Design a binder for this molecule. Structure first.
Ligand SMILES: *[C@@H]1O[C@H](CO)[C@@H](O[C@@H]2O[C@H](CO)[C@@H](O)[C@H](O)[C@H]2NC(C)=O)[C@H](O)[C@H]1NC(C)=O
Ligand SMILES: *[C@@H]1O[C@H](CO)[C@@H](O)[C@H](O)[C@H]1NC(C)=O
Ligand SMILES: *[C@@H]1O[C@H](CO)[C@@H](O)[C@H](O)[C@H]1NC(C)=O
Length: 1034
């Protein structure tokens, strides 16, 4: 069209103007040095204008730019023609990327449905390698492989997909090899795949735990791939030493089940699998033991006591065979509720008139008289909240109430002086008949006329546990997470967990009972004349023990005076996710808290302290540190380059230790100041240490999103800004030191060779590698194609390069071309690579589809092995050209794509991937680099080839068909191999040779009387020499 021809004329005009302006910028390999108006084939201008005449013939004919620019005079590669072809081709693809991007990103694909069919109604211009991608809804985008498509982009999906999943699709459109050229299509509606077959994912067990000696709880949420709607579950509990297995089919709505009637101290195996309409899925297994059998002490051996509470009396009775009965307090009015303390020994009373009286006691005797403690409600009350029920928080020392306003019923918390009222929960209409606080698990349970409830201590999670008509006395086990509730009208006795899902009736012995207590498996039951200890299956006519009562006709509450009624200790402690970051003399160790049960709220007791064990591995000596208040610790005064073994455990408020963590093995750095250099995305540079502390904000200010900076010498550095710009800063004195005035577009990475004294970068526009002298600014085009990242070995001069597909080595001759890795582009691309010189190794990162893989290879020409070191399966990936080698640690270091963390993999221990946090004044980071402690060595004079003398160029005597031109053999200081690039200028035609000999075996000369111009360019693998231009007549 007419829009296409303007793009072709603009790209061709910009290409010809680019060959005009850059005609003196590059030194050619043969030392050409044309004038500004010569118009001969040797020059930069004619070959570069040959590059801009064959860029559109190379796209339509679909030939490479190296295949299109194939000259017999310049063999094997013509650098200005190939370079002008690739900048003109990526200028064309950049203009076609901006020409279509609104119509690409505004029109949206539609799914129609037999195989799955995507319809994408785009009308592309006639002026003109698409990829279809998929993403799992509730990740990263993965490349789809099997698709058959029409030319109108109605695309049929032939890849077999996972059933009963949601899939969102898009069209990735790559304009040309450049990654930026890719334009993404908009998002699709999520598609339910039709379900078939068995499930392929196991259920995920969140909390599997033992409640007591005869109960065992499991909580789970379903796994990711279900392949149908859930019809139910299959739970199979099997003993390790036993022949009785219990199978239970639990339906789809339940995510918790509690096994009952088990055995004590038996370490159980639970099989958990999904059930759908088509089959049964895989089995997830977990290992737990039940608790030990609690001691059924006989009726002769009982040293505990009970509190027997009437309407008008509080009575103390010891549980001895000789029963001691004493009257603690007698009131002239009726009581409503009490509270009690085990360690403070305080016993608050609340009457029917709503006056709160406090009292203290020991051994059934009153040691402090009953003072009246009034409630200072303050701004919380709206007036006349007279109290009805009462309970006590034994951890936060709070009194929890339930009042009455004549209008509504409200639970508050107040202090032991009544000074701090906090309204908890919302108002409700039914009266509380019993109020209990679970202080250890952070719950409060109350019971009304029709039901039983559950709040936490701040009122956040309100749950109704049970609906039953007229419930009686309920008692709370905090250690076993079971509420035992008596039903007096129905005559049974019922056993409820804290979520309310597990209920179980128990045999109540027949008399009505209006209170109970639970001593072991036995049941303390009051009457009007006696208190009996019955073991839950026996009759009331034959108890295990009996205690007579005289002055208590009515007894609505029995409170057992044990410390297990009000515990301090959660009795389960296991710290997890132990991590450690290490320096030379110090370590930064972070773990997490022990995890919360489903029967524990956010107001639970989380008062654990920690003990960390540090084991020296080489000497087997352990020092143990204690009383760590928090989930982090910083170790100090360690030994450098030593392996340490680290375990941690939790110590509860009682001081009872928990179970040790599975050990982490980690090694300190070697001794020395090891300075890590950071660069923020704003452009600021700080210098930290091994641990990320000791920050020094440097004076230099870089450009936005910089890469790693390559030293040439101690003033001048070169870095690649992340839009593609290559910069140059003198850190010391800024008005001199840098040969380039402007930044350079379309540069991938940059390296420096210290021996040749040459800066190497990848020109992504020219698809080649540019070698540049930093003292002068003369550039040299090198025939290394499609390279993104470079490295050079200084011992022999091999250039190691990374394509997005391959990783290879460029030598002086093409016999030395060794390719180390190849990957398909749908599988992934190489993210960065590191050449190791001292141990003769290579490392590279491969950015996969949802994965990050790390590899290793030697530097031999015949490769011995190739080891995949470590794989990270996640959406978080690396910054490209950010892999660094830590040669003191023996480790690899890369920066993650978010820029707020970095990953370290040690070569001795690859499984432990250390996380190092980015410091706060450079907190979005784009570069991380370990500084070399030694300075850079200067330029070797033993790699510079000497100039061939102009009087030494002579012709040997021979015929006209076979001439021989010879010269003095150029050498260097170190005796390296010196090769020669040669130019023959006779008549109009030209002839170029590459030689490894100081003579030239010359043929195909036409005749005699020929004036013959000779150019000698000596070179080594690091650096080319000056050009010797003589004039010789045959
Ligand atoms: C670091 O290297 C730079 C070149 O990259 C050196 O600067 C050159 O030094 C001479 C001597 O004064 C100047 O006349 C040149 O103009 C500089 N070259 C360029 C290209 O600008 C510099 O000497 C080095 N610095 C140190 C401290 O060694
Ligand atoms: C429970 O039994 C399994 C073997 O079936 C064993 O691996 C596990 O350690 C046992 N748990 C204990 C002893 O706590
Ligand atoms: C190079 O060879 C010469 C001639 O034998 C010798 O004197 C010199 O030491 C050699 N230099 C090196 C660096 O090997």
């Amino acid at each position: 069209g007419v829009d296409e021809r303007m793009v072709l004329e603009r790209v061709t005009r910009d290409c010809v103007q680019r060959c005009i302006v850059e005609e003196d910028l590059f030194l050619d390999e043969f030392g050409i040095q044309c004038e500004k108006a010569d118009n001969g084939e040797k020059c930069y201008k004619t070959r570069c204008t040959k590059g801009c005449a064959q860029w559109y013939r190379a796209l339509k004919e679909l030939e490479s730019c190296q295949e299109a620019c194939l000259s017999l005079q310049f063999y094997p590669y013509d650098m200005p023609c190939i370079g002008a072809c690739e900048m003109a081709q990526r200028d064309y693809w950049h203009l076609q990327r901006l020409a279509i991007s609104h119509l690409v990103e505004r029109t949206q694909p539609q799914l129609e449905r037999t195989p799955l069919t995507i319809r994408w109604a785009m009308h592309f211009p006639e002026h003109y390698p698409f990829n279809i991608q998929y993403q799992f809804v509730d990740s990263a985008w993965f490349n789809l492989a099997d698709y058959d498509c029409d030319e109108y982009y109605v695309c049929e999906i032939l890849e077999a997909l996972i059933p009963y999943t949601q899939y969102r699709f898009r069209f990735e459109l790559p304009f040309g090899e450049n990654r930026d050229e890719v334009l993404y299509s908009p998002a699709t509606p999520a598609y339910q795949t039709p379900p078939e077959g068995a499930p392929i994912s196991a259920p995920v067990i969140e909390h599997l735990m033992g409640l007591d000696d005869s109960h065992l709880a499991v909580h789970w949420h379903p796994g990711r791939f279900t392949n149908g709607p859930i019809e139910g579950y299959r739970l199979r509990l099997s003993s390790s030493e036993g022949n009785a297995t219990s199978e239970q089919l639990v339906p789809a709505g339940r995510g918790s089940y509690i096994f009952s009637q088990l055995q004590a101290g038996t370490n159980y195996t639970l099989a958990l699998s999904m059930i759908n309409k088509q089959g049964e899925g895989p089995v997830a297994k977990g290992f737990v033991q039940t608790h030990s059998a609690r001691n059924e002490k006989p009726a002769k051996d009982l040293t505990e006591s009970v509190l027997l509470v009437g309407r008008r009396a509080v009575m103390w009775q010891s549980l001895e065979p000789a029963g001691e009965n004493s009257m603690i307090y007698q009131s002239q009015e009726e009581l409503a509720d009490i509270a009690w303390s085990k360690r403070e020994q305080q016993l608050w009373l609340l009457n029917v008139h709503g006056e709160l009286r406090s009292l203290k006691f020991e051994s059934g005797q009153m040691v402090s008289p009953a003072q009246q403690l009034k409630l200072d409600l303050g701004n919380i009350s709206s007036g006349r909240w007279v109290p009805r029920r009462l309970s006590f928080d034994w951890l936060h020392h709070r009194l929890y109430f339930a009042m009455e306003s004549p209008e509504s019923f409200q639970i508050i918390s107040t202090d032991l002086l009544g000074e701090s009222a906090q309204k908890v929960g919302e108002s409700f209409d039914l009266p509380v008949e019993q109020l209990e606080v679970d202080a250890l698990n952070g719950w409060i349970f109350w019971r009304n006329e029709e039901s039983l409830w559950r709040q936490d201590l701040h009122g956040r999670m309100i749950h109704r546990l049970l609906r039953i008509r007229q419930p009686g006395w309920f008692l709370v086990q905090p250690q076993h997470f079971i509420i035992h509730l008596m039903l007096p009208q129905e005559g049974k006795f019922l056993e409820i967990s804290y979520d309310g899902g597990f209920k179980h009736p128990l045999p109540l012995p027949p008399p009505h009972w209006q209170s109970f207590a639970l001593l072991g498996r036995s049941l303390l039951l009051p009457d009007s004349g006696q208190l009996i200890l019955v073991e839950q299956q026996g009759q009331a006519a034959s108890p295990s023990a009996s205690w007579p009562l005289k002055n208590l006709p009515d007894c609505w509450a029995v409170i057992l005076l044990v410390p297990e009624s009000q515990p301090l200790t959660s009795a389960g402690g296991k710290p997890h996710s132990l991590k450690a970051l290490l320096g030379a003399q110090a370590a930064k160790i972070s773990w997490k808290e022990p995890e919360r049960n489903p029967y524990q709220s956010a107001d639970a007791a989380r008062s654990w302290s920690y003990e960390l064990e540090v084991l020296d591995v080489a000497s087997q000596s352990a020092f143990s540190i204690r009383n760590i208040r928090g989930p982090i610790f910083g170790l100090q005064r360690l030994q450098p380059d030593n392996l340490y073994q680290l375990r941690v455990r939790a110590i509860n408020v009682d001081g009872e230790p928990g179970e040790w963590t599975e050990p982490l093995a980690a090694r300190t750095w070697p001794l020395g100041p090891h300075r890590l250099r950071w660069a923020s995305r704003q452009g600021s540079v700080i210098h930290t240490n091994e641990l990320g502390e000791g920050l020094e904000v440097q004076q230099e200010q870089l450009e936005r999103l910089p890469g790693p900076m390559t030293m040439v010498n101690e003033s001048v550095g070169y870095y690649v800004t992340g839009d593609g710009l290559l910069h140059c800063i003198n850190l010391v004195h800024s008005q001199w030191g840098c040969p380039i005035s402007e930044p350079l577009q379309h540069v991938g990475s940059v390296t420096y060779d210290w021996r040749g004294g040459r800066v190497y970068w990848t020109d992504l526009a020219r698809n080649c590698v540019v070698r540049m002298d930093p003292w002068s600014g003369s550039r040299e085009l090198l025939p290394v194609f499609e390279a993104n990242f470079l490295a050079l070995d200084p011992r022999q001069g091999h250039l190691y390069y990374a394509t997005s597909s391959q990783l290879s080595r460029h030598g002086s001759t093409p016999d030395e071309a060794v390719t180390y890795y190849r990957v398909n582009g749908l599988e992934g691309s190489i993210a960065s690579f590191v050449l190791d010189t001292q141990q003769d190794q290579l490392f590279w990162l491969v950015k996969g589809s949802g994965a990050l893989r790390l590899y290793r290879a030697p530097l031999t020409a015949g490769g011995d092995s190739l080891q995949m070191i470590q794989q990270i399966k996640g959406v978080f990936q690396a910054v490209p050209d950010s892999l660094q080698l830590l040669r003191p640690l023996g480790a690899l270091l890369w920066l993650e794509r978010s820029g707020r963390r970095a990953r370290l993999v040690r070569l001795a221990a690859p499984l432990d991937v250390m996380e190092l946090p980015t410091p706060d004044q450079a907190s979005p980071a784009s570069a991380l680099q370990l500084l070399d402690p030694q300075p850079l060595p200067p330029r070797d004079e033993g790699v510079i080839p000497m100039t061939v003398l102009p009087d030494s160029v002579r012709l040997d005597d021979g015929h006209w068909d076979d001439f021989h031109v010879r010269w003095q053999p150029s050498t260097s200081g170190g005796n390296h191999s010196v090769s020669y690039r040669l130019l023959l200028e006779f008549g109009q035609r030209l002839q170029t040779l590459d030689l490894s000999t100081p003579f030239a075996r010359l043929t195909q000369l036409p005749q005699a009387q020929l004036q013959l111009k000779i150019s000698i360019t000596p070179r080594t693998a690091w650096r080319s020499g000056d050009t010797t231009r003589v004039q010789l007549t045959t």
